[PDB]
Symmetry: D2
Subunit: 119 residues, 4 copies
């Protein structure tokens, strides 16, 4: 299932719960251990996916502010959960920083990340 | 407060209502252009609740999964962008829309676009 | 309809020829005036588009190196030409910088631009 | 070097020549089929990259029209070449289809692909 602890290619970890209603709620930790690198995450998923072998669509956001740090930026991940033995969540993400109007053209990075339940 | 809480309209007529929490939470309801109650979906997200005061915008993002009690598109959109407050407040976003696919078909799983929202229409 | 001079909302301009064979060839000026700000553009377009009112798919690339400057970057624009009283090319773009593998996660910006045809 | 034959995860292949002047030219072949599935590619690359362990920025376009078929669409790939033992080209891409105005919101797919010179 989606609920659990997930690991990114380069060590990021996130813990999420998938609610009956389609909610995602949890915490995203940018660096292994370390209280100062944990951030709130919230999102949504398709709680009644197709039964044709497709994945389950989802997305979530982290604003990079906690009680210790603020990067004045937020990342959204959009993707799907693929169940099985080696369950995976495959994503593409957008990272937007607060900018002046003149710098808005360079406000947003794009990338991709794959998460697995194994370290 | 920050001026995010309220009702916002995009260039295509979609509208959303949002409440910005003092802690960084975004909650609300997104209504696609066509349909009324059949077209309302849950939205949830996060924003920078302590933004810079140097002329920069306020970073945010939110997600809508396209399932409600009427319809299910087996898809979800995430919007990433910044809020520009004041007299002519706007939220400028780029978005990704992922539909559930097999891995073989994942190359056609994700659309990209951009939406600008105003508190006016 | 594509052949000609085009300008975007932020002031950049380009001049392009759409060849009978599908080629796009031209010059991109990142800043109106200023002859040290011209770069080679090349790309491709659909030379036999649908006749149902749909736009014409196209794309092009500029590497940001010329005789005077080198940003070690390249932008690609993907979009469609929409004919009209005021013709437009509506695009989304990706700007990738050369990075170390460690910084590859922040190698690529994403944005959008609309160009309007001069005269 | 960039010049050579490259392979994608799910069977696409392309052949490219990198000119001394920053030009990319070649042919892209979709996974299934052959000449029916071969298309012209053109692009640009940084012909003098940084000497600091950074990759080499590049981009190219394919319009999905050849003598046999026409999908009324085009893909642009933006990325970088990373040299050495296992040389790779890492990209993100945008695929735009010609659409009516009402369908323009869903004109553009986004993805990512890595290419290698090995099988």
């Amino acid at each position: 299932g989606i609920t659990g602890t997930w690991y990114a290619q380069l060590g990021d970890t996130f813990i999420v719960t998938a609610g009956a209603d389609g909610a995602l709620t949890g915490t995203y930790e940018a660096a292994v251990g370390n209280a100062e690198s944990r951030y709130v995450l919230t999102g949504r998923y398709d709680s009644a996916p197709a039964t044709d072998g497709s994945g389950t669509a989802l997305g979530w956001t982290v604003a990079w502010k906690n009680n210790y740090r603020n990067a004045h930026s937020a990342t959204t991940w959009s993707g799907q959960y693929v169940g099985g033995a080696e369950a995976r969540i495959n994503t593409q993400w957008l990272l937007t920083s607060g900018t002046t109007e003149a710098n808005a053209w360079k406000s947003t990075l794009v990338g991709h990340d794959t998460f697995t339940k194994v370290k």
